[PDB]
Symmetry: D2
Subunit: 235 residues, 4 copies
């Protein structure tokens, strides 16, 4: 199977796989059963922003999510990503719906990785504030599309803007990312994305994740709903 | 054939295809016969730096090359790159040798492209200050290799560090680059590379170019020597 | 007197000092009588964005202004800023009202200057997306205030949000900016600001400018209205 | 007295104020008696690089120092800098000599601070790779000079390049830096400097520090030698 490190914005509490009984932000290390969660006051139909940060000195994966006019939610987990992930990875966004549903709309997505050696800097940076019909520097998987209202729709939306159930889709940056090099004295990354999660229902599902994977990563079979397009099962 | 826009650091004067009678920097628009050149006081065995800049407001492709302790050479040419290049491109470095030869060593390579819309910014940035044996975010073509002394060798070098004749190689960034979008009010790019051109001979050949191409670009047949791995002929 | 290079968003046509008979974007070199103008379809009460770019290779000062859902206006002028401005400068925003009036609200302001030598990079960058009551890295002159709705108000606004006539104010970045150095092979800058110009009247006045000045620059006496807080007279 | 947070490259072991018995990197919170140290294999006459990183989510101040061809030294300390430093600060470099001496030469210095709100980004960035005689965007204190070989000499050097004893000097960036804002959901900074510490003696002294201070910070009386131009005493 794929190797996955993810930050999840989990809109639907599945308490039998260890979700808390509310929408939550979580850190996922090779399992949909988050190593750490925090309560998330998700706002149906409002534009949110998530920030993810990590460096190889501190070995702490941290994330913050907020809306305008609202308090933030934050979560952290101590993990050395050089012991979890391979040297080369792809970075992406993933979302799903199940029998409960929501839009998984991405308005913007930025990523920066830096490797400083003892010589110094290797860097990759991308920023999307608009997506075109044919976004050649993304790999779209499953139901993901680009260019509707200039946005990235990770899951299926009807012509009327209405979200569909039982949907899964991801977008990965085309270029592999080098997150470990033998001469690096500091390796760091940060990601930001802005999202619009909207549902006609009181119980939206299932969420959006930022993820880092082996470069050949694909949507596992049956990873709609609670598995967020990331994991083949709930182990 | 491929569509090529290049800046050439041309080490060897081929006066029958319109080179001036000295090493020169040139702007190449779909032809090895530069639209504009400037004299270049090339220094055998010294580390140089080239800078390339362009924006869609000015529509002027400009370049500067220098060595420490030396004056610069500069060249400019008025060209609208939206009338020459497709919407999506790849960016790369190219070099060649012929019956005369030189090392075509790249120590560092950076590129930034920005598209600002009327909404604003889509950006791509990469920086290499070291190259590994397996550089997964480059496409290496012909004789190009990575990881020898942490460098990119565009043309064949022996174990002893000695340059080979009749060699051609290129490196392209893995991800396609979006240089025109319908909503963009300003589109800009800049590139920098540092190079070491060394030859045991008084007459080194043939040079190094920064180039922008159709995304599927490959080394044309018989593009060693004066054609710089860029053009299938001297038209 | 001060030395001023400015890009003006001129909301009010003063045809006796050579304004065209419509709102316009202009390039001002040591005179309120623009060296070049373009028609500007100014939108009362809409958030706009202006971009300014320059480099020492091309010696061309260019600007673009747009609103969401609208075409852009652009203007360019060939000028070597090393022949106009001193080696060290301050960068700022300026606005005014007269007997006609408007808000001169700045929501965001970014600036980047780079000097690349033949050794390479000296850089300054700042970005404001929010302004606090006490913004210690700005010099506020005349009626300029910060922190109202998190914004920079260049000219006087009442508690009710209503613009006042006969007002002039500027904001300069605290740190001097080095725009020429003897070893530089390329010197470049870019600025962006987003603005909200709103008036209860069919004829708003007078406009907003991005400017570069001697470091000790101050608001000239009687530079309300058509002189934009930049010039002591209309010569 | 001033409020100081510093990372020290301490070349001389003063074991009565808790230095370990070797050159060391340390984290200084309002005291020259480091809260944490690591052994530093200082190399007389070699160019080194130090990196400093912090963010308000992790609340961990970390630093790495290396030379080409050598292993790194790293130190970290958990500290919330919003509980130590005021909202607005200045950032700088400091060095000293005593009865033992060394050059405290700075070849390059970069700093980036970002405040992301829930609206997002306020940023400051500067990069020096060359220093001029009259560097108007630095405040030089005590014996610090700029422009000798294009470098920043923090402590007194003779015309012959020979370091002087009993010397203290600092350089602060001219513009105040905003490191806390009420709407910020993440605040981060990183600093890098490259240094050349050279001495004709087997026992160089005293070291170089990167520091953050109240904006009006000045060299305390009698802060030559072991106090590094940072502290008025060894408490
Ligand atoms: Ca769930
Ligand atoms: Ca030639
Ligand atoms: Ca006017
Ligand atoms: Ca000591
Ligand atoms: Mn969960
Ligand atoms: Mn040529
Ligand atoms: Mn005008
Ligand atoms: Mn110490």
């Amino acid at each position: 199977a794929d190797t996955i490190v993810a930050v999840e914005l989990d809109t639907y509490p599945n308490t039998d796989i260890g979700d808390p009984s509310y929408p939550h932000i979580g850190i996922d290390i090779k399992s949909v059963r988050s190593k750490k969660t925090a309560k998330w006051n998700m706002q149906n139909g409002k534009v949110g922003t998530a920030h993810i940060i990590y460096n190889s000195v501190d070995k702490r994966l941290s994330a913050v999510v907020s809306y305008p006019n609202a308090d933030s939610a934050t979560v952290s987990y101590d993990v050395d990503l050089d012991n979890v992930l391979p040297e080369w990875v792809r970075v992406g966004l993933s979302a799903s719906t199940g029998l409960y549903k929501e839009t998984n709309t991405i308005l913007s997505w930025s990523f920066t990785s830096k490797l400083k050696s003892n010589s110094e800097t290797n860097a990759l940076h991308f920023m999307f504030n608009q997506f075109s019909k044919d976004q050649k520097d993304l790999i779209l998987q499953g139901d993901a599309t680009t260019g509707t209202d200039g946005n990235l729709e990770l899951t299926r939306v009807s012509s009327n803007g209405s979200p569909q159930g039982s949907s899964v889709g991801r977008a990965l940056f085309y270029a592999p990312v080098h997150i470990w090099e033998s001469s690096a004295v500091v390796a760091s990354f940060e990601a930001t994305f802005t999202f619009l999660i909207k549902s006609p229902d009181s119980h939206p599902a299932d969420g959006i994740a930022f993820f880092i994977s082996n470069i050949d990563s694909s949507i596992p079979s049956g990873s709609t709903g609670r598995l967020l397009g990331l994991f083949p099962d709930a182990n």
